[model samples]
Target: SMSVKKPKRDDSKDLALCSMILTEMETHEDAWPFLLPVNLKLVPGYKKVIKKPMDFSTIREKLSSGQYPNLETFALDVRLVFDNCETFNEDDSDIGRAGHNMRKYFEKKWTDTFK
Candidate 1:
């Protein structure tokens, strides 16, 4: 599993990537002066996938070389470009829903590589 090191300073006050992301908050629009810090609750099992380092060369070469389609290609083209935040649809049928599903899909296909 991978670990994320905390940044040196308070990100909200620092005004960098954190500030940029904070500005994208849904609330405080057309009313507030500055963006407010919103507490984010991560879904359970999010860490399980996140903490694990991803190795996609086997998948990448396959996709690039015209083999079976995999999550990496799907994500790079569809989710990352079209939906950076990976937002789900009203019916919960979007890349975010598909991402978790793809994890299972790829794992099944590349069991040895993942292990």
Candidate 2:
């Protein structure tokens, strides 16, 4: 028996799946709530609960700077946006509802393209 390293399946192409999906996400109608960083002045407690506080704007920077080295990591950050939303807002409230919808959108989109 011998140990072996697998081939590299990492994709680092510019404007690839992650980038394109981000573009569509930023423009989604429900995206208004998630476009920019949450306003800290109004939501002072935001930092207490949502430690990572991800949004499309910040993610765009992450992508541009090549911080997301792999698709799974990139996707994880994307999901964090909604997870935080659910943790902060009430389940039936506008933002909470939007977060639910957006997550489903990304899921379907990812599967459609990623498959």
Candidate 3:
């Protein structure tokens, strides 16, 4: 009998960060452009076009492969993504709230992974 392989579980940390970013994107289309360039540079041609439910699995792969010079640099890139959304609202709308949550998510992830 042939055996079926189960899909590997995604890293919790990566999923968490990706989930936060996706949530923000769900509320704001502007978030895609903010993240696209960085993602493309990190993993060339990772995606032909930015689509809903963005797949950030490569982020974990890159992390494991030491693609980032340091955690600080990665964190800064994450910050920049969120920063791009600042003009989405006046820090009082749904987009603003989502952005705030995304920032909190990154902070927590960074603390958990880094010192």
Most accurate candidate by lDDT: 2
Ranking by TM-score: 2, 3, 1
Model 2 stretches with alpha carbons more than 4 Å out: 1-15
Residue-by-residue lDDT tens digits, candidate 3, 25-70: 4345433344434444564433443332122243444555666565
What is the C-alpha lDDT profile of model 2 across 16-110, one tens digit per residue?
A: 87899999999899998999999877896898878888999999999889798778888898899999999999879999999999999999988
Runs in model 1 with CA error above 4 Å? 1-93, 112-115
True-structure RMSD for candidate 2: 2.2
- Per-residue lDDT of model 1, residues 1-115, tens digit only: 2687766543232223222222332132321211221112544433343332222333234344545343344334322221322332222545345444443443443343222
Which prediction has more favorable lDDT, 1 or 3? Answer: 3
Global lDDT scores for all candidate models: 0.32, 0.88, 0.50
TM-score of each: 0.22, 0.88, 0.43
Candidates' RMSD to native: 18.6, 2.2, 12.9
After aligning candidate 1 to the native by TM-score, how far in Å is the CA of 101 from where it should be? 1.2
Better of 2 and 3 by lDDT: 2
RMSD from true fold, candidate 1? 18.6
lDDT for model 2 comes to: 0.88
Give the better candidate number (1 or 3) by TM-score: 3
